[PDB]
């Protein structure tokens, strides 16, 4: 038991760091979805002007 | 917003200038219809006058 507690603690911390990578990834995933939609709408301006 | 703004302004100026240019020349059409259907009625009852 006193060694399984150590295994659980280290694996939980690594799971949290894996969630860190995942959540930071999803975070700028959102922002870059956002910025590319920015450029798309910037020229959808010309789309709808000329359409 | 400004993209679909210029979209909308052109899209409605479309159905606008359509009826507009149609109005221009349907109007000058009736203008000469006027000058003409004038000389129609003007002398129908010039002979029928006599």
UniProtKB/Swiss-Prot annotation, chain A:
Transmembrane segments: none annotated. Phosphorylated on Tyr residues after EGF stimulation. There is a cross-link at residue 45 (Glycyl lysine isopeptide (Lys-Gly) (interchain with G-Cter in SUMO2)). It is found in: Cytoplasm; Nucleus. MVP 3 mediates interaction with PTEN. The vault ribonucleoprotein particle is a huge (400 A x 670 A) cage structure of 12.9 MDa. It consists of a dimer of half-vaults, with each half-vault comprising 39 identical major vault protein (MVP) chains, PARP4 and one or more vault RNAs (vRNAs). Interacts with TEP1. Interacts with PTEN and activated MAPK1. The phosphorylated protein interacts with the SH2 domains of PTPN11 and SRC. Interacts with APEX1. May interact with ZNF540. Required for normal vault structure. Vaults are multi-subunit structures that may act as scaffolds for proteins involved in signal transduction. Vaults may also play a role in nucleo-cytoplasmic transport. Down-regulates IFNG-mediated STAT1 signaling and subsequent activation of JAK. Down-regulates SRC activity and signaling through MAP kinases. This is Major vault protein. It comes from Rattus norvegicus (Rat). The chain holds residues 660 to 710 of 861 of the full protein.
């Amino acid at each position: 038991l006193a060694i399984e507690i150590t295994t659980n603690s280290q694996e939980a911390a690594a799971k949290h760091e894996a969630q860190r990578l995942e959540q930071e990834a999803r975070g700028r995933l959102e922002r870059q979805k956002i910025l590319d939609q920015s450029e798309a709408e910037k020229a959808r301006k010309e789309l709808l002007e000329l359409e | 917003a400004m993209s679909m703004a210029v979209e909308s302004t052109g899209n409605a100026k479309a159905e606008a200038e359509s009826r507009a240019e149609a109005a221009r020349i349907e109007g000058e059409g009736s203008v000469l219809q006027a000058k003409l259907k004038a000389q129609a009625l003007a002398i129908e009852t010039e002979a029928e006058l006599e």
